[PDB]
Every structure is written in C-alpha cells, then in structure tokens.
C-alpha cells in the first residue's frame, strides 16, 4: 500500500553558507525508506544537490483529511520511455489522494508498460470544480442521475446441483 | 555442563537464572494519565497541509 | 547484576521518552528536529557462497 510522505531536507551547513535552504517535497512510497530515496533522486535530478552533502531533516506521513467524501484528483507525471521524454495529465475519481496514485500507477503499467522508477509525479491537486474536469468519464460520473446495471463479477464447493441464478 | 540449550524467552526458569531482574520489571506503566495535550502548532499544520 | 540491569532499563526508557519529547516540542514550535544517526547496524548475509 502506498503512503503519502512529506519529506523535508537540506544540505549540511558549512563555512561557505552558515544557514542552508530548506526543501520540502510530497511523494508517495510504501515505506519511509523508499520515500527518502526517491526524495534524494529528485533533488539531485533538480537542484543538483548531492545526497552525501545533504540530509533528511523531517519525514511525516499524511492521511486523507476527508476520506469519506468522493473527490476528483488531477495528476501530472513525467515518463521515461524509449524516447525518454513525455508528460501527461490524468484525472481519477476516488476518496483518497493515495488511492488515485495507486490507480494511476495501475493504468500506466497496464497501457504503457511503465515502472515505478520512471514515473516522477510533479503534482497532485484535487479538482473540486465540475467544469475544470477534462475527462468525459468523470463528467459522466458527475451527473445527478447515476444509476447503472451491475458489472459482471464472474464469481471449493464444486458440482453445484442447480443452475446458478447469475442475476440481480 | 549444558547438555541441552534452553531458551530464556520460553523457559521462565532459565530466564530467572540469566536475568535477576525479571521478577520486578513492570513492563506496562501508565504515563499519559489525564493530560494528553495535542502538540501541533498551526505553522506545522499549514506546512503539512500543503499542495 | 540486578541493579545494573534495572539501571540499563531505566536508561532506555528515559532515552526513548526524551526523543519523543524533543520531537513533540519541535512539532509544536514548528521547527524540525533530526534524530541522531545510529551507531549500531545488524547485518545479515542473504546470498550464498557461489
């Protein structure tokens, strides 16, 4: 299960700079070991700050403030592929920001055969406004007349005596 | 001497021999009785509740 | 030996609580407190001799 970790890190003080800058990042990882490692990847990737010259000063797991209210989340990712340069924006409807990312990691792997290492989520933001939704399926999920038939569940107890009802 | 090795974490008699302190340990001691003050300032909450 | 064992257990409890109290104070004050790195590491070999 993924967890949203808030990681704050900075370079160690030296004679050149008395006080260093503080960098905070939000990223998703199963355990704090992965989050700290991914956080160091981004700073090197971005600020070109060495891990050996820096340290992690704060780590904190973040829980969903409103996990009982359905929301729509917009997610931006960067893709490393055969071309090695791509960027896409996707929308998901759920109750937990972490749940969107787990669902997000599912479709990239399903469609684009992508991996956890390649994807670097730039930003996740809740899209409260219905008009801001750019995806048709979410818009269909936002109508006041949501009522649809059941998707088939294809459910030892071998050798049933009677034909199953397989209906409502 | 020592024909067979006995685990102190299962044999209480061997544990009492090895550690002359298990007789008075008090593993569970109530610390937070009736105070439990929530210690998280608004500055920390704002930084945590970001993006 | 019994007195030494009790002192060690008292030291462990105080050292754990003070880490919690320091983190609680830093959290309330809004600053960041980084615990000290550990000097003890338990290493297990996972691959064989081939």
């Amino acid at each position: 299960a993924l967890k949203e970790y808030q990681v704050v890190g900075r370079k160690v003080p030296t004679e050149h700079e008395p006080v260093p800058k503080l960098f905070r990042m939000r990223l998703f990882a199963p355990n704090e070991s992965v989050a700290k490692s991914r956080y160091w990847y981004f700073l090197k990737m971005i600020n070109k700050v060495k891990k050996a010259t820096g340290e992690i000063v704060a780590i904190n797991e973040i829980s969903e403030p409103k996990p009982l209210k359905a929301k729509v989340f917009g997610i931006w990712i960067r893709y490393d592929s055969r071309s090695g340069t791509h960027n896409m924006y996707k929308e998901f409807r759920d109750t937990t920001r972490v749940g969107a990312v787990e669902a997000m990691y599912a479709d990239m792997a399903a469609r684009h055969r992508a991996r956890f290492r390649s994807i670097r989520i730039l930003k996740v933001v809740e899209v409260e406004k219905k008009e801001d939704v750019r995806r048709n399926y979410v818009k269909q999920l936002l109508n006041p007349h949501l009522k649809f038939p059941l998707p088939h569940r294809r459910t030892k107890k071998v050798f049933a005596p009677h034909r199953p009802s397989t209906f409502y | 001497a020592h024909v067979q090795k006995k685990n102190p974490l299962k044999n209480k008699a061997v544990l009492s021999r090895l550690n002359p302190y298990a007789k008075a340990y008090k593993a569970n001691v109530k610390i937070n009785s009736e105070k439990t003050p929530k210690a998280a300032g608004e500055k920390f909450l704002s930084v945590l509740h970001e993006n | 030996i019994a007195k030494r064992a009790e002192a060690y257990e008292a030291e462990y409890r105080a050292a754990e609580r003070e880490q919690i109290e320091l983190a609680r104070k830093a959290r309330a004050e809004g600053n960041y407190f980084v615990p000290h790195e550990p000097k003890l590491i338990f290493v297990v070999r996972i691959r064989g001799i081939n």
């Binding site: 704050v8 905070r24 971005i46 670097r120 730039l122 | - | -």
Partner: peptide, 19 residues
C-alpha cells in the same frame, strides 16, 4: 548528534520535478 533546525527566515519551499 541531535540538533534542531530553526524554520525562521528559512521556511521550506515545495519542490516539483521539471517537466
């Protein structure tokens, strides 16, 4: 050793990867 990092005048800045 254990030490504190004051956040006064050194507020954290949120970082995002470059697109």
């Amino acid at each position: 050793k254990a030490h504190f990092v004051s956040t006064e005048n050194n507020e954290p800045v949120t970082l995002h990867p470059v697109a």
